[PDB]
UniProtKB/Swiss-Prot annotation:
<dbReference type="GO" id="GO:0051871">
    <property type="term" value="F:dihydrofolic acid binding"/>
</dbReference>
<dbReference type="InterPro" id="IPR024072">
    <property type="entry name" value="DHFR-like_dom_sf"/>
</dbReference>
<dbReference type="GO" id="GO:0046677">
    <property type="term" value="P:response to antibiotic"/>
</dbReference>
<keyword id="KW-0817">Trimethoprim resistance</keyword>
<feature type="domain" description="DHFR">
    <location>
        <begin position="1"/>
        <end position="158"/>
    </location>
</feature>
<keyword id="KW-0046">Antibiotic resistance</keyword>
<feature type="binding site">
    <location>
        <position position="52"/>
    </location>
    <ligand>
        <name>substrate</name>
    </ligand>
</feature>
<dbReference type="GO" id="GO:0046452">
    <property type="term" value="P:dihydrofolate metabolic process"/>
</dbReference>
<dbReference type="GO" id="GO:0046656">
    <property type="term" value="P:folic acid biosynthetic process"/>
</dbReference>
<feature type="binding site">
    <location>
        <begin position="95"/>
        <end position="102"/>
    </location>
    <ligand>
        <name>NADP(+)</name>
    </ligand>
</feature>
<feature type="binding site">
    <location>
        <position position="27"/>
    </location>
    <ligand>
        <name>substrate</name>
    </ligand>
</feature>
<dbReference type="GO" id="GO:0005542">
    <property type="term" value="F:folic acid binding"/>
</dbReference>
<dbReference type="GO" id="GO:0046654">
    <property type="term" value="P:tetrahydrofolate biosynthetic process"/>
</dbReference>
<dbReference type="InterPro" id="IPR001796">
    <property type="entry name" value="DHFR_dom"/>
</dbReference>
<dbReference type="GO" id="GO:0005829">
    <property type="term" value="C:cytosol"/>
</dbReference>
<comment type="pathway">
    <text>Cofactor biosynthesis; tetrahydrofolate biosynthesis; 5,6,7,8-tetrahydrofolate from 7,8-dihydrofolate: step 1/1.</text>
</comment>
<comment type="similarity">
    <text>Belongs to the dihydrofolate reductase family.</text>
</comment>
């Protein structure tokens, strides 16, 4: 099974200038809990944005060019990325925009955080047809002293 996980600001913005400008520790905790001990697939730009391997996960990087770091696994196509994960129950695709576009048709589950923040961005999450997805979990949180915007965690499953 393939799942996508992402955090979206208003208008489905996911990034700006190869960065995420907000800081929401509760969402990073949700990301870690839902990805630990699973393989994670990311594109090369997101690998450069993160800047180091994510511990406790098999890190698979999609790039058309040879890898430059043997702490992670480099693959050259979607099919190779999937095969490199082996026979696991759940593969997590962690972006960015171009990578989400390619895996969305193959995904059975979306883990989405909706952040109530207006962000100038240059990268968006793909348009997804709402009729194809059922919301199976949602949890709203007001802003607090650690998290400066309200946010909604949602899990959707393909119908
Ligand atoms: N809010 C969130 O949840 C979230 C999550 C992830 C990322 N982001 C943000 O998203 C942005 C990065 O997104 P992005 O769309 O620019 O880039 P991306 O999807 O991270 O990376 C695209 C790169 O991945 C490689 N790639 C993608 N598909 C491939 C394929 N089929 N075969 C081979 N290589 C492939 C290519 O690398 P080569 O050029 O080396 O071939 C391509 O240029 C940043 O702003 C980051 O902060 C946000
Ligand atoms: N919901 C969600 N939030 C995100 O921030 C996110 N980020 C990415 C890509 N970028 C990043 C950037 C940093 C870290 C990171 O530092 N993660 C640590 C945090 C642990 C914690 O804060 O408790 C990790 O071990 O996962 C992960 C992904 C992809 N999907 C996401 N999905
Ligand atoms: Mn092929
Ligand atoms: Mn197999
Ligand atoms: Mn806000």
């Amino acid at each position: 099974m393939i799942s996508l996980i992402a955090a979206l600001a208003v208008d489905r913005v996911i990034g700006m200038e190869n960065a995420m400008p907000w800081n929401l520790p509760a969402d990073l905790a949700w990301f870690k809990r839902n990805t630990l001990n699973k393989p994670v697939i990311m594109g090369r730009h997101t690998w450069e944005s993160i800047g180091r391997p994510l511990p406790g996960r098999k890190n698979i990087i999609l790039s058309s060019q040879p890898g430059t770091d043997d702490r992670v696994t480099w693959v050259k196509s979607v099919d190779e990325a999937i095969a490199a994960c082996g026979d696991v129950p759940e593969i997590m695709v962690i972006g960015g925009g171009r990578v989400y576009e390619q895996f969305l048709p193959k995904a059975q589950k979306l883990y989405l955080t909706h952040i109530d923040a207006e962000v100038e961005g240059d990268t968006h999450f793909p348009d997804y047809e709402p009729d194809d997805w059922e919301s199976v979990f949602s949890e709203f949180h007001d802003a607090d002293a650690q998290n400066s915007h309200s946010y909604c965690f949602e899990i959707l499953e393909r119908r």
